Amino acid sequence: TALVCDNGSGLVKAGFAGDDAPRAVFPSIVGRPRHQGVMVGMGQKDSYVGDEAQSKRGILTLKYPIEHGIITNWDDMEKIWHHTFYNELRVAPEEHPTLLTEAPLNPKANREKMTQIMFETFNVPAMYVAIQAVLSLYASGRTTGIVLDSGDGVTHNVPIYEGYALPHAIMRLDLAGRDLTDYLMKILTERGYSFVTTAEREIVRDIKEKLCYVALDFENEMATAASSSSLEKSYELPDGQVITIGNERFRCPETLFQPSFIGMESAGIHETTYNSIMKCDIDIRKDLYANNVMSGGTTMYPGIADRMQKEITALAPSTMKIKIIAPPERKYSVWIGGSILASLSTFQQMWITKQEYDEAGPSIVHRKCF
Amino acid sequence: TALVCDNGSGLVKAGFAGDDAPRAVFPSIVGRPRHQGVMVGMGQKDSYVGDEAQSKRGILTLKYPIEHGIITNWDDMEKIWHHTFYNELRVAPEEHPTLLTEAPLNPKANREKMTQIMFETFNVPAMYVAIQAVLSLYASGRTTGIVLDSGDGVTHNVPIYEGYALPHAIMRLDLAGRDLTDYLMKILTERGYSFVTTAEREIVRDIKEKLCYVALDFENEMATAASSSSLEKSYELPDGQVITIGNERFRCPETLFQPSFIGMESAGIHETTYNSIMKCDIDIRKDLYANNVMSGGTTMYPGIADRMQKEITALAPSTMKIKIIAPPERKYSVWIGGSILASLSTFQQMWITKQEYDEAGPSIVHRKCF
Amino acid sequence: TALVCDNGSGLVKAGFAGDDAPRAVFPSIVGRPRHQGVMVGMGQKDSYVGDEAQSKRGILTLKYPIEHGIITNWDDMEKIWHHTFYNELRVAPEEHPTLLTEAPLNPKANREKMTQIMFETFNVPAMYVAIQAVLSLYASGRTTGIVLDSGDGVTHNVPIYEGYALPHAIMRLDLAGRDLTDYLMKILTERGYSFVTTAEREIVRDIKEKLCYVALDFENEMATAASSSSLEKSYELPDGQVITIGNERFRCPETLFQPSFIGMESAGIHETTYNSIMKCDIDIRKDLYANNVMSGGTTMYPGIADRMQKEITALAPSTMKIKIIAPPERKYSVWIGGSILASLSTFQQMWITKQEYDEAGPSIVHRKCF
Amino acid sequence: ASFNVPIIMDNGTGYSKLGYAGNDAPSYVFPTVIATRSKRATEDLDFFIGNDALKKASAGYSLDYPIRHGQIENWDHMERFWQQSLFKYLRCEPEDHYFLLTEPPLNPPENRENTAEIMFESFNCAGLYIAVQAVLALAASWTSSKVTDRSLTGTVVDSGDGVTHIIPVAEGYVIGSSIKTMPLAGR
Amino acid sequence: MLSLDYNNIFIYELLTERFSSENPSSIDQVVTDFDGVTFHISTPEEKTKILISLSMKCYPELVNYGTLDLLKQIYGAYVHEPEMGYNFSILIDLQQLPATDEEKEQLAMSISMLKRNVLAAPFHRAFTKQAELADLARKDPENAPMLDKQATSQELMAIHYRDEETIVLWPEHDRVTVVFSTKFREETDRIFGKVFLQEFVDARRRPAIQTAPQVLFSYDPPLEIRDIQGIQKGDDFGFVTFVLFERHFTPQNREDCISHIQVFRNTLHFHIKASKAYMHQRMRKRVADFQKVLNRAKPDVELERKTATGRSFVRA
Ligand SMILES: Nc1ncnc2c1ncn2[C@@H]1O[C@H](COP(=O)(O)OP(=O)(O)O)[C@@H](O)[C@H]1O
Ligand SMILES: Nc1ncnc2c1ncn2[C@@H]1O[C@H](COP(=O)(O)OP(=O)(O)O)[C@@H](O)[C@H]1O
Ligand SMILES: Nc1ncnc2c1ncn2[C@@H]1O[C@H](COP(=O)(O)OP(=O)(O)O)[C@@H](O)[C@H]1O
Ligand SMILES: Nc1ncnc2c1ncn2[C@@H]1O[C@H](COP(=O)(O)OP(=O)(O)O)[C@@H](O)[C@H]1O
Ligand code: BEF
Ligand code: BEF
Ligand code: BEF
Ligand code: BEF
Ligand SMILES: [Mg+2]
Ligand SMILES: [Mg+2]
Ligand SMILES: [Mg+2]
Ligand SMILES: [Mg+2]
């Protein structure tokens, strides 16, 4: 059985091909302790990874080795893969072929280092590097659709028709759940709460999951929030202090539809989706509008399917039905899709075998993977 | 003295008939502040146009009002004509009859609306709307030749013999220097340089102008640059950071010869020129191959004359001369040709005059102009 | 005329717009007595404010009503504003508009209660609440730059280009001269000397203000003070006894460049400045790098402009010039800049007026002052 | 002259009262307030007035009151307040109707000039009467319009939201040398 | 506001009050509207009973195009004898009133919607006859051009709906064409009206709004209206034509399309006025920048320090 490992910017989702859910799901984090280690022994390690670093976060300077789907710190990244195989999945990777993933428009150097580390240190027998928004479409069980993926580090559209991607119509946008968390820290400062350490940024990341939502009509929800008590919700910090939060619940996710909130020039995810469909060749558009497959954890906000469907219906010509397809498991669907693709009997000829890496070097990956 | 404007799809060129070169050349741009003004006393201004918008661009969202040689935002095009008249040339539009310039196979509505604005908003005494390629033969001193014009927005061939144009054999292609900037921004991401904004587009336009070239054989130049640093160059961003550029130095201009790079289905500029000559009557082909005239800034890449001569010599019959006349002033040759046409003694009867417009409406333009 | 009242967290700085420098500078302190008030009569007062408290401090519990630039204690902050207007400026506040200030990224309620107390207690005729790092840029004679203001309670960066602020690139750090005072007590404790009380915290502030300086290269300064007499010198207490200090003189200021000393996870002030420049759009970064502006009393350490220029030149690309602008009057530049602003003729249109407050309520400041 | 019912507008500092001559109450009585913002330019189309502009303080508009102390003193806001009164609420065509406008006795000539050029050049109304407001208020006292119910001599004390003034009128003539005005009233 | 309401606001607000009211008062209220229309609302027999009545100069033409069957369909039991001096009248009883707050809301809407329900009759006659011609043309596509040719002259509606206008419309198997013979008599509105009508035609010729009706314009009339009464080519009229295709009046759209096409000329009339309010705010911006060009002629002197009310002050 092959491994499937979605190297996400916020969560590593990993497991075995042909299982129907990820086996490991943990923060894509390395943490090093930032304080005087006064006590001899006590189980101390020079660095903590994933759920250890999340459990001990009060004593650690956490950092993510991934920024916008690009591995920025390779020495921290080897520790995450080592932890994934040996501690979290508990299998020697030298015996099992692995399907990795990345976003479109990544640097080629990212993919070359990633394949070199996988052969030249973990000795993986064969491996592959799928485009994340192709995997999502296998999880939905479709050949035609426009995959809106938004994660922790990136948002991207790939339109695909009858199994062919239109690579000229790929739109990528470096705004995702990390930037919405840093923006939620910003706007929480106006309500009176200060979150600033990388351990406190994880509490703001947790408020974002449990309280935030997408306002179906933003300026009507602003007028409602400014004139009501019933919009507000309260959250227990790890301290037992209770915070309360209001119009800040929908102003945070509304950054996806107004990237000018975080100072960006980009059009929002409704317009960069429509600008991908309107970059396709004309006859496929009618089948893309009826198959907007959403994926990645940033699409989990309550009301994002309805706001997305309302906004694209206001851009698109009115004589045709829009359907935003939001599966209930969409959070993991890039991994679920990898679990199908790595299992397909027609796919198991497409691996990079280590014999090919041994003759060609890491530049094998560009002539074997999309 | 008449005026002449080539309202280019990316640079405005403007001046007076009988001058050797444009009086004013500036980006066909309008920019509005994206941020909030905090200083008082500062000369806060609601829109900047031309070189002032290009200079202040770090705080502006920049729009081009002409898309593929078609005016698409009229309000920001009226601003640009008001800038050409009152700020750049600094002459009132009512004083001088004025030659405008347009691409072939445009919407009829584009040339009517450009006539209605000039007579009813700028109140000009007379005007004419010449085809951009017909002016390139005046600049080149010819009466027989096939033009290959290529600007920011559009590329087109107009074949002409003894001054008779062949309007059935015009080939027009919505691929030129803008789509080469859009593609260079895309492939720059593969080396790790993310350029995204409407102002970073103007840095990537400058990289394209300073460093790119057309390689005489692409598969050979690719195999060359894959082995070596000798084809690389480096460019200092306005940030003081240096980027370094590889085979994307010449894989960018190759889009002209291989439009399938940007996904679009069309003949490259070599085959589209040969198809224009093969549509022409058989006795004139033998002279169109001998008088092949280039114009517009996208024809400025080093080696594009030798690439174009190599490809036409491979398509056309070997028994006869292929001779490409790409002159060194060709960057402005539409305007230079317009400044000759508007200066002729025999042209002064051919203007659409104000008294002759308002007895017929803007539909006069299609029955005096080509 | 209009008052300019920069109620900073360590010093109130107050005076009249268009006056040269602040005429009322005093501790932002309210002192209350802590002892058996035995002698009847004697001119005793239930609390003392400013220099009247600072001179009596040996019998008072001194407390600042303001912490990290946020008002914590309004019943004492009204006591400081009442002292400012009636005892220190000797005006009637109902006769003059007040320009107040606050640091960016403050609570909304701070700005509301500060307008409400000015209109409902001090009965002020009109008022405005400027951002302190905008005011510091007027006081530099500039319309673009990156103000590093650092006071007693807050350090913040505000990047500005052509008078537009880039609010996404504003950095706040809750570290300034009071944390350096609390750290100087923590390290003075190691040599032999204990300072504990709210009054003894002022003696060590008066050490920090004249013994301390910033090392140009801390790790080599540390070796030089550990091997020579030349870095050591002494200060004479109110009790006549002498305090001798050495590497404490530059370890204290170094907390700004290394916040890890006081247990903070953050960038230092040098890397916080660069993280603000690198958040800005790419075309403005050169004009920010050549216009860093130091301001506020924590930037008064001997050698901090030389150190700041060294550390930023190591972070910035070597291709381009760095300047740190640090006038000798940077001790008061936020007041100086408010005194420019409150005298500019367009500014008299921008005040919140009494009548407009009465009709709109205290939320008017959120839709007029930024 | 046109025969259409003259339109009547008492723009107070507090309330504008709007209607058509010969009706038994104003068609509208609502505050003299305008809600305004504080790639085409439309910030002069986005405004609201009256009871529908109090609802807008929470939607991030700034309310302002363009009449203060009985006088119009923002002419941008008052022009937009009149266009919206005429074309949304009164729903009339100015070229068909005579208008009665009202102002206090001691208004500056500049405000009658600005009122006239806005009415005649912006809206193009058929004709205008700018009545001194307390001179009218005597005629509300009558038991009916009929000549035997009139009592054309009486002091009239007017006090709105923004000005109080006392006008003596006798035998149908306003004794203008004796008007008293005090800009202290309901606000 | 960016676009006009279709209903008369006053009747909507007034009936929304009386339908909520526990204790109705009496009323007598004439109420003007656009296109020379006028309502009268009054309580003649009791405070309990509201009579709403309408006056409109072209109502005699609208009765020829089937109006009374449309009004009897809409207002049913509430229809009343026409009030003397008015064309149509409806008597609504506040004690016999519908039960739910959403029935009250839609009845107060429906009664305020009277101008566009009386002026809708020729549009429903054209839409329902185009639905017959669409079936006959689908029976024989070679006969279809001749059915269109005869319906273009036999089924044509003309309404002289105000003295400086005419609306002319006719069905053909795939469309309803409607022509506004439109004139602005006020000369400053005629000058701006040339710009507003020209830029309206030039707007339809852009990729963004191709989904809209095909608009066309001239100043002489379309060939099929050149012999209608009151249409004259020389008198400085303009002839804005809308072609509504079968997709512009599909069953979900018909009612909005009727409501929205009647208000056409009134949005141009409103926006010509609301453009003077724009040009003024843009003029007083350039005046405020010419102030700076004169201010450099005043010599620099500090005016003395003063309290907020302008009284003199003694500090600094
Ligand atoms: N229920 C949720 N509601 C909102 N946001 C969520 C939710 N669950 C996860 N997220 C956000 O989604 C991001 C993780 O999504 P994921 O698809 O796993 O990204 P990635 O693949 O790049 O690691 C994080 O920023 C996280 O906070
Ligand atoms: N030296 C050059 N080398 C390569 N490209 C150039 C050069 N000079 C200009 N260009 C490109 O040509 C275009 C401008 O050419 P121009 O003839 O003025 O086009 P247009 O008339 O349509 O505005 C731009 O895309 C510009 O970047
Ligand atoms: N010469 C100096 N050297 C070092 N610190 C100084 C010096 N002068 C003032 N400070 C410190 O600056 C702080 C007051 O600065 P200020 O800008 O007025 O702060 P704030 O605006 O917040 O009140 C105090 O911590 C004070 O000790
Ligand atoms: N019963 C009342 N007692 C006192 N004041 C009232 C009463 N009813 C209304 N007002 C006040 O009347 C004023 C409005 O009167 P109005 O004649 O409309 O003034 P204006 O014409 O200047 O707008 C407001 O101050 C309002 O609060
Ligand atoms: F890297 Be995650 F997909 F944003
Ligand atoms: F005018 Be450019 F040549 F498109
Ligand atoms: F409040 Be001071 F500016 F730190
Ligand atoms: F303005 Be109100 F008449 F006092
Ligand atoms: Mg992901
Ligand atoms: Mg050109
Ligand atoms: Mg300060
Ligand atoms: Mg009044």
- What single string gives the DSSP state of each residue in A56-77? TGGGEEEE-SEETTEE--HHHH
Alpha-carbon distance values, E75 to B123, B165, E60 (Å):
55, 68, 19
Which residue, A254, A260, A261, is CA-closest to A221? A254
Which residue, A57, A107, A108, A52, is CA-closest to A80? A52
Reduce the DSSP state of residue B64 to 3 states and report it: coil
Which residue, A191, A182, A178, is CA-closest to A11? A178
Count of H-run helices and E-run strands, chain D: 3, 14
Q: d(Cα A248, Cα A244) in Å, to the nearest integer?
A: 10
D85 lines ligand 8 (CB under 6 A): no
- Give the H/E segment covering residue C288: helix C285-289
What radius of gyration, in Å, describes the C-alpha atoms of chain D? Answer: 17
Q: d(Cα A233, Cα A250) in Å, to the nearest integer?
A: 12
- C155-161 and C30-33 beta bridge pairing: unpaired
Could you tell me if A287 and A208 are in contact, meaning their C-beta atoms sit under 8 angstroms apart?
A: no
Is any Cβ of chain E less than 8 angstroms from the Cβ of C96? Answer: yes
* Dist. CA A101 → ligand 5 center (Å): 10
Could you tell me if C33 and C25 are in contact, meaning their C-beta atoms sit under 8 angstroms apart?
A: no
Beta bridge partners of C130: C101
* Cβ-based burial of A109 (10 A; exposed 0-12, middle 13-18, buried ≥19): middle
Is any Cβ of chain C less than 8 angstroms from the Cβ of D82? Answer: no
Neighbours of E263 (CB within 10 A): 18
Furthest CA-CA distance within chain D: 63
* Sequence-distant (≥ 6) Cβ neighbours of residue C33 within 8 angstroms: C44, C46, C47, C59, C60, C61
Which residue, B52, B79, B77, is CA-closest to B65? B77
Could you tell me if D130 and D101 are in contact, meaning their C-beta atoms sit under 8 angstroms apart?
A: yes
* Dist. CA D120 → ligand 11 center (Å): 56
Contact D58 A219 (CB under 8 A): no
Residue E248 CA, chain-centre distance (Å), reads 18
Q: d(Cα D71, Cα D111) in Å, to the nearest integer?
A: 8
* Cβ-based burial of A81 (10 A; exposed 0-12, middle 13-18, buried ≥19): buried
* Dist. CA D26 → ligand 4 center (Å): 15
Q: d(Cα C306, Cα A273) in Å, to the nearest integer?
A: 50
Contact B38 C163 (CB under 8 A): yes
The pair of three-digit structure tokens given for residue A213, joined into one six-digit string: 């939502």
Q: What does chain D come to in residues?
A: 187
Contact C282 B199 (CB under 8 A): yes
Is any Cβ of chain E less than 8 angstroms from the Cβ of A318? Answer: yes
Q: d(Cα E316, Cα E312) in Å, to the nearest integer?
A: 13
Across C76-199, where does the E strand assignment appear? Answer: 98-102, 126-131, 145-150, 155-161, 164-165, 171-173
Q: d(Cα C46, Cα C31) in Å, to the nearest integer?
A: 9
Neighbours of B246 (CB within 10 A): 17
User: Ligand 7: residues whose CB is within 6 Å?
Assistant: C 8-10, 69, 151-154, 176, 296
Question: Which chain D residues have a beta carbon less than 8 Å from that of C368?
Answer: 38, 62
Which technique?
A: cryo-EM
Q: Where are the alpha helices (DSSP H) in chain A?
A: 51-55, 74-83, 108-120, 132-140, 177-191, 201-210, 218-225, 248-251, 269-277, 285-289, 304-315, 333-341, 354-360
Any idea which residue has 């009501």 for tokens? A228
- Provide the chain C residues 222-281 that lie in CB contact (below 8 A) with chain B: 280-281
Chains that touch E (3 or more CB pairs under 8 A): A, B, C, D
Torsion sign over Cα A19, A24, A27, A28: negative
What radius of gyration, in Å, describes the C-alpha atoms of chain C? Answer: 21
C251 lines ligand 3 (CB under 6 A): no
The pair of three-digit structure tokens given for residue E312, joined into one six-digit string: 């003199």
Domain limits of chain E?
A: 1-129, 131-302
Question: Ligand 7: which residue has its CA nearest to atom 3?
Answer: C151
D12 lines ligand 4 (CB under 6 A): yes
Is any Cβ of chain A less than 8 angstroms from the Cβ of D59? Answer: yes
- Amino acid of residue B21: A
B296 lines ligand 6 (CB under 6 A): yes
Core vs surface per residue E194-216: b (16+ CB within 10 A) or e: eebbbeebbebebeeeeeebebe
First to last CA, chain C: 23
Q: What is the crossing angle of helices E254-262 and E264-295, to 10°?
A: 60
Core vs surface per residue C200-230: b (16+ CB within 10 A) or e: bbbbbbebbeebbbbbeebeebbeebeeeee
Mutate to test the pocket of ligand 8, among D9, D13, D71, D187 (most ligand atoms within 8 A of CB): D13
Q: Which of E305, E308, E316 sits opposite C97 (nearest CB)?
A: E308
First to last CA, chain E: 51
Q: d(Cα B16, Cα B342) in Å, to the nearest integer?
A: 9
Reduce the DSSP state of residue C322 to 3 states and report it: coil
Q: d(Cα C335, Cα C26) in Å, to the nearest integer?
A: 13
Alpha-carbon distance values, C206 to A241, C187, C203, C236 (Å):
37, 15, 5, 11
Of all atoms in ligand 1, which is nearest to the CA of residue A8?
Answer: 23
Could you tell me if A103 and A156 are in contact, meaning their C-beta atoms sit under 8 angstroms apart?
A: yes
- C292-295 and C324-325 beta bridge pairing: parallel
Is any Cβ of chain B less than 8 angstroms from the Cβ of A167? Answer: yes
Contact D44 E2 (CB under 8 A): no
**What Å resolution does this PDB entry report?**
3.2
**C293 phi and psi angles, rounded to 5 deg:** -120, 115
Q: d(Cα C140, Cα C161) in Å, to the nearest integer?
A: 14
**Residues in A lying within 8 Å of D, measured between beta carbons:** 219, 222-223, 226-227
Enumerate domains of chain B plus CATH numbers.
1-26+68-133+333-366 (3.30.420.40), 27-67 (2.30.36.70), 134-180+270-332 (3.30.420.40), 181-269 (3.90.640.10)
Beta bridge partners of C101: C130
Could you tell me if B356 and B364 are in contact, meaning their C-beta atoms sit under 8 angstroms apart?
A: yes
- Give the H/E segment covering residue C11: strand C11-16
- Give the H/E segment covering residue B11: strand B11-16
Q: Which of E192, E194, E204, E205 to mutate to test the interface with B (most CBs of B within 10 A)?
A: E205
Beta bridge partners of C70: C67
Q: What is the crossing angle of helices E187-203 and E264-295, to 10°?
A: 110
Could you tell me if A149 and A295 are in contact, meaning their C-beta atoms sit under 8 angstroms apart?
A: yes
Q: d(Cα E153, Cα E173) in Å, to the nearest integer?
A: 14
Question: E131-302 in CATH: which number?
Answer: 3.30.1460.20
Residue E215 CA, chain-centre distance (Å), reads 17
Question: Which chain B residues have a beta carbon less than 8 Å from that of E198?
Answer: 116, 120
Could you tell me if B80 and B50 are in contact, meaning their C-beta atoms sit under 8 angstroms apart?
A: yes
Q: Which residue of A has its CA nearest to C72?
A: A192
Torsion sign over Cα E169, E170, E175, E177: negative
Reduce the DSSP state of residue A3 to 3 states and report it: strand
Reduce the DSSP state of residue A250 to 3 states and report it: helix
Q: What does chain C come to in residues?
A: 370
Q: d(Cα E119, Cα B106) in Å, to the nearest integer?
A: 42
In angstroms, what separates the C-alpha of B75 from chain D's closest C-alpha?
8
Q: Comparing E1-129 with E131-302, is the CATH topology the same? A: yes
Count of H-run helices and E-run strands, chain E: 10, 10
CATH 2.40.100.10 for domain D2-133, yes or no, is no
The pair of three-digit structure tokens given for residue C141, joined into one six-digit string: 């004679």
Could you tell me if A153 and A178 are in contact, meaning their C-beta atoms sit under 8 angstroms apart?
A: yes
Could you tell me if B184 and B210 are in contact, meaning their C-beta atoms sit under 8 angstroms apart?
A: no
* Cβ-based burial of D43 (10 A; exposed 0-12, middle 13-18, buried ≥19): exposed
Reduce the DSSP state of residue E176 to 3 states and report it: strand
* Dist. CA D119 → ligand 12 center (Å): 20
Across E72-120, where does the E strand assignment appear? Answer: 79-80, 88-93
- Provide the chain E residues 79-138 that lie in CB contact (below 8 A) with chain A: none
Which phi-psi region, left, alpha or beta, contains residue C355 (left: φ > 0; alpha: ψ -120 to 50)? alpha
Is any Cβ of chain B less than 8 angstroms from the Cβ of A179? Answer: no
Reduce the DSSP state of residue B248 to 3 states and report it: helix
**B194 phi and psi angles, rounded to 5 deg:** -85, 110
CATH 2.60.120.20 for domain E1-129, yes or no, is no
Q: d(Cα E237, Cα E224) in Å, to the nearest integer?
A: 17
Which residue, D114, D103, D128, is CA-closest to D2? D128
Q: d(Cα A185, Cα A193) in Å, to the nearest integer?
A: 9
Which residue, C36, C33, C26, C58, is CA-closest to C47? C33
Which phi-psi region, left, alpha or beta, contains residue A163 (left: φ > 0; alpha: ψ -120 to 50)? left
Is any Cβ of chain C less than 8 angstroms from the Cβ of D38? Answer: yes
* Sequence-distant (≥ 6) Cβ neighbours of residue B87 within 8 angstroms: B50
In angstroms, what separates the C-alpha of C1 from chain E's closest C-alpha?
5
Q: d(Cα A59, Cα A52) in Å, to the nearest integer?
A: 11
* Cβ-based burial of A26 (10 A; exposed 0-12, middle 13-18, buried ≥19): buried
* Cβ-based burial of A279 (10 A; exposed 0-12, middle 13-18, buried ≥19): middle
Question: Ligand 2: which residue has its CA nearest to atom 25?
Answer: B177
Q: What is the crossing angle of helices E264-295 and D75-84, to 10°?
A: 180
Residue C144 CA, chain-centre distance (Å), reads 21
Which residue, C143, C117, A266, is CA-closest to B41? C143
Q: Give me the DSSP letters along A136-150.
A: HHHHHT-SSEEEEEE
Q: d(Cα A219, Cα B304) in Å, to the nearest integer?
A: 53
Q: Where are the alpha helices (DSSP H) in E155-253?
A: 187-203
- Provide the chain E residues 189-248 that lie in CB contact (below 8 A) with chain D: 189
Q: Where are the alpha helices (DSSP H) in E144-303?
A: 144-154, 187-203, 254-262, 264-295
D65 lines ligand 4 (CB under 6 A): no
Could you tell me if C161 and C169 are in contact, meaning their C-beta atoms sit under 8 angstroms apart?
A: no
Q: d(Cα B15, Cα B10) in Å, to the nearest integer?
A: 17
* Cβ-based burial of C74 (10 A; exposed 0-12, middle 13-18, buried ≥19): middle
Q: Which of D5, D22, D88 sits opposite E1 (nearest CB)?
A: D88
Q: What is the crossing angle of helices A108-120 and A74-83, to 10°?
A: 50
**B221 phi and psi angles, rounded to 5 deg:** -65, -35
In angstroms, what separates the C-alpha of B166 from chain E's closest C-alpha?
28
Could you tell me if C170 and C156 are in contact, meaning their C-beta atoms sit under 8 angstroms apart?
A: yes
Any idea which residue has 């809308």 for tokens? E242
The pair of three-digit structure tokens given for residue D40, joined into one six-digit string: 């085409």
* Cβ-based burial of D179 (10 A; exposed 0-12, middle 13-18, buried ≥19): middle
- A242-245 and C24-27 beta bridge pairing: unpaired
- Amino acid of residue E197: L
- Give the H/E segment covering residue B205: helix B200-211
The pair of three-digit structure tokens given for residue B254, joined into one six-digit string: 């190759």
Beta bridge partners of E157: E169
Any idea which residue has 């003299």 for tokens? D32
Q: Which residues surround ligand 12, an ion (CB under 5 A)?
A: D 12, 160
Instruction: Considering every ligand atom shown, identify the ligand nearest to the alpha carbon of residue A68 and give its number.
Output: 5
Cα angle: A280, vertex A283, A286; to 5 degrees? 90
Question: Which chain D residues have a beta carbon less than 8 Å from that of B32?
Answer: 39
Is any Cβ of chain B less than 8 angstroms from the Cβ of A169? Answer: yes
